Amino acid sequence: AYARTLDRAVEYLLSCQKDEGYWWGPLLSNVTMEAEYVLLCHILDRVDRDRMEKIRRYLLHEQREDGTWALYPGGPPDLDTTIEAYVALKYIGMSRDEEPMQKALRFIQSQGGIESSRVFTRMWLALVGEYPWEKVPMVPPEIMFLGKRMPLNIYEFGSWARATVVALSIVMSRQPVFPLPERARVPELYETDVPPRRRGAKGGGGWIFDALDRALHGYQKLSVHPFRRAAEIRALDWLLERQAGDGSWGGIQPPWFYALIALKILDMTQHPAFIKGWEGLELYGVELDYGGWMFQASISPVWDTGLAVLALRAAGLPADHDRLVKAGEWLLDRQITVPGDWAVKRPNLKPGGFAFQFDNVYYPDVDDTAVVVWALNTLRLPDERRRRDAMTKGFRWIVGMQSSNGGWGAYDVDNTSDLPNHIPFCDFGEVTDPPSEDVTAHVLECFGSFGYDDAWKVIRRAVEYLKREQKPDGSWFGRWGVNYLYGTGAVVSALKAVGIDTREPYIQKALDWVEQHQNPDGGWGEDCRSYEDPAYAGKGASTPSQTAWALMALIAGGRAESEAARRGVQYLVETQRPDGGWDEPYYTGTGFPGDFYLGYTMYRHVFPTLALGRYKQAI
Amino acid sequence: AYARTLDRAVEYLLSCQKDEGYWWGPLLSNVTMEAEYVLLCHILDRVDRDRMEKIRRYLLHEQREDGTWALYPGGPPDLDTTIEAYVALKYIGMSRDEEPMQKALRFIQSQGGIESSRVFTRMWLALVGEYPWEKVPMVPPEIMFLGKRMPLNIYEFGSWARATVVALSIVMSRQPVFPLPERARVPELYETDVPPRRRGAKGGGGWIFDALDRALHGYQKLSVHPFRRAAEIRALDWLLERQAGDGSWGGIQPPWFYALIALKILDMTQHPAFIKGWEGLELYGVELDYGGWMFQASISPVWDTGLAVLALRAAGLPADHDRLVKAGEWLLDRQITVPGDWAVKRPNLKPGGFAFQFDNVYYPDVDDTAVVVWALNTLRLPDERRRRDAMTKGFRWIVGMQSSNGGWGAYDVDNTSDLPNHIPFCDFGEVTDPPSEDVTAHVLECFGSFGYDDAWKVIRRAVEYLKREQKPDGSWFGRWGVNYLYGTGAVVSALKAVGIDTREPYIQKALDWVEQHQNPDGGWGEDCRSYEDPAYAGKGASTPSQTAWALMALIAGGRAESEAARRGVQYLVETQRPDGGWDEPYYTGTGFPGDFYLGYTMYRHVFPTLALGRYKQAI
């Protein structure tokens, strides 16, 4: 029955595989990427009329009937996303009259205008001189003097936030302004009677920081700031040291952009680092068939390649299938062998991790490393010396990254400081990188493939972590994926692999939870709203990926031969396309709970295949 | 008479002009460049068999009958140059038996072997493990902690030495060894009974430094060196900040190569600065028509373009000649506008200088800047706003560069510290950058073109400098050119332009000196030996350039209508080629008096033209 679905899914995946032997699906987010790119160009005085055009199509293409933009497809209108998109358009050419601009402006007004937008959105407008710098949370270059074991030192922030802060310190130090031509001035973002509803700090504003912030805005006005020069060079240096091979910074949109501006501020437009970081942007761009152009918040080669392999294996292809070897070989060349920031906590840990993108050595993540090593562990490559060695280095690294609570973070160890969550500046998304259930789960499943069971201390400490973190209804939160189905599926699948007993009470209590949220159409769905409102916990339109997850959770718990189980499999079979692929008009990926969502293109093809491969195994 | 010769010369230059509108002749030196390149590749594990071949033909081709290599054509055999060339060859494939190897080795031995070579030559061999690191002058990373106003702080060394030291500190800190395959081991460089005659420090070795060095090799052996890590990073950052646009460092062979090695040592072969720094080398390479390949100690676009224009103007072409405009425009885009190291002494001086090579913003030199501004001053470009503006920036910069003695240096101001000239490490060439007569002369000639005479204090202070520096026989030393003819010609030409009286006693005493060294053939010659032995002061085979110089000195002193004067003109007219050019099998350029000589390709064509253009003016 499903076999024909599998065969068709396989030849499809294999078709999508690039020549070098890796897979790479585009990553989706929201328009703040493109909108900020437009402004960045303006700042660096490098505007290409042709690019602006493609960008304008995209922006509009993404606008909804009501004239706004959301964080995910079918999501509620977002203020910040729309404010930025609005400014971006008005700069490209759009007159504040045209219908689209009308609808957007009205929504922006009905919300309290520019005065209600996140800190970033206001800062960008500050850079172009449309908002007072005095009303922007201050982040001094001097932050660079905090030691390794001090409150608020850069290494207390998560990798993604860290680089940004360092970069912005330099920017806010000078508080530069790059005026927009009169034609694009956006005063109408203030015209509003609605009371401005400002978003506070992620964890709550402590009067201390509030005070301090004002203290910094005052000091910022003095005539002399002793050692600031040194503070700035400290920041600049930190940046020149960690620039990524592709010319980016961390392989993410945020710090990259800011870092460039910081150099432009320091008259280094014709320094190697600046030039590289600039022409490096193109790689992250994407030409849309309808004339539009988009920029990616990040790229996922390693990731896609990793899952791609695992899926095709559980599917049926030989552990030495010449096509999967191209992947195996490729992955091996990716392994990082040099100390990154993670080393500040583990100076004696030997490098061996992997990263999300192509060439980003200073920021390998636990999630990727696990999937990659586990994937290789299933292949039989030509040089067994390399495969054997690679797996070892990586394995030993993942073990040395385990945090205090037995769980695994994503980039650093025990990055659980709760201090940064109160700073005025931090009011958007996560700022720290503590251990999560999904990452941990993935790690355990990686060990499980090797054999290491519950007998091993490392594993027990982790399993204990998961047990304590399980939700009342028996589900598991989803951090880097949407959401409880993603998490519940991850854990159960893992626990099953590390040897734990699938008959346990807490286990069963989870499987029942899965069968319970199965939609009528036989599949499973969970809307992104599940991060905001608990009513959407496991509820939502059925998607190929989210189904496959809730399905792996069942196959793992032994209930592979069940009603709900066979039911779901049917969904994947019927919803499949003639070419063998699958469609998924929703986001199943998470950046920051409730603040940033991602659309992983491959998920729709890879996961359904992996699930069907595991279902075929259960018989 | 001479007109045809001039016309013939002109059309030639104009034919050599690149499309972009600039001129660029290759720069010649000795084989230590290519030989060190070979080793560099080995270290970075990037050897291209095909290249090695082209480098071999080159090396052999440059070897003389006696089986040695000198610092200049027709020069005495050099030990260092030959030792390095020898090792380079043996590594490429040459067996110690073959004739070339025999003759070369013999010479090496008759001199005391490896133990007599300069500090560098021994260090390179140390890097490949053929010489003990303990016997190499130590330069600690800690040198990075010396303040701006302290003994031996990096800013006390001249620009070219400075960058190198910073780079090498990192290298010597680790004292790495990259073993040569048994096949190329060079123990035979020790086999010698001749007593090793070592070269001491440039200015004399004070037992203080001698002992100190020992202390360093001692401290180098301890188990802990507090703050060294920080000293290294201090030096690494310094390098990252000053990497040149073209991925080089200073636009010179030395620091560039070492910088790369220092990055390789720090496992940064993946970092952008290294990548760009590596692939940037090709630009300095040169394919020889006989199958060989050479590397340039540096490149001279700006310079060549600068003189090229001035020559073609004094010759006769219109100040707005569309072809010279291409040059004018080009030069304008070159002007540096950002603070370099020179700014450490003149924080309030506005950027406006130019550099020797294509893109090297942190190191503009007085010489270039003067020639360029002066050259622009003689043109009529479409945008008189920029031409006027540029000249001003450049002018003001030059002035703000004048040192205490009224004389101008090349890169920094009052870089006359005599401390560095005693360090054990510094035993090759110049290490400081004090004011010279030639640079100063060139500067005065630039101001003269505008109109500023002897009334202006700036000028007078400079002229006083020259007067005090004149030699007993009435000649002027040549620093960046060979030699007294180069200098004497520069000064007199300048003095004439600033308004000074050409009838003065000290002036005439110079012109007579010129006429007294006019070779029988009607031309002028001055061998590079004139730096070593005073017998060759103005003595040597006649060359097109050196003649033109001694000829401009006469035309300036009013003696344009003289016997010696017309005599010389004849030489240039006869020795001229059918194509209009000129040949010059000798070096008329200087890097370091008595240690490094350069062959400026263009000189033979440009200067003879400029002189004939000025001779045509005298009538």
Ligand SMILES: CN(C(=O)Oc1ccc(Cl)cc1)[C@H]1CC[C@H](c2ccc(CN3CCCCC3)cc2)CC1
């Ligand atoms: C828009 N973003 C952002 O981080 O904004 C901020 C910047 C600075 C600060 Cl202080 C706070 C937020 C995004 C930056 C990229 C980030 C991102 C992080 C990780 C990954 C890949 N990751 C690792 C491999 C497995 C799981 C997925 C992909 C994207 C997701 C958030």
Ligand SMILES: CN(C(=O)Oc1ccc(Cl)cc1)[C@H]1CC[C@H](c2ccc(CN3CCCCC3)cc2)CC1
């Ligand atoms: C081989 N070299 C060297 O500098 O070695 C040392 C390195 C470190 C130390 Cl401590 C001592 C010597 C050379 C490095 C390049 C140097 C050089 C300097 C200036 C120029 C251009 N110059 C400026 C424009 C007009 C006059 C010519 C061209 C080349 C000539 C010497």
Ligand SMILES: CCCCCCCCOCCOCCOCCOCCO
């Ligand atoms: C120049 C000294 C090199 C020794 C440093 C290795 C120690 C590991 O770094 C500790 C962690 O700090 C994070 C930085 O790693 C990024 C790049 O560092 C650049 C070259 O060392």
Ligand SMILES: CCCCCCCCOCCOCCOCCOCCO
């Ligand atoms: C990095 C601090 C910004 C200072 C630049 C403003 C220029 C003021 O002159 C200060 C003198 O600094 C001398 C160094 O030249 C080095 C260039 O490295 C580039 C980064 O500024």
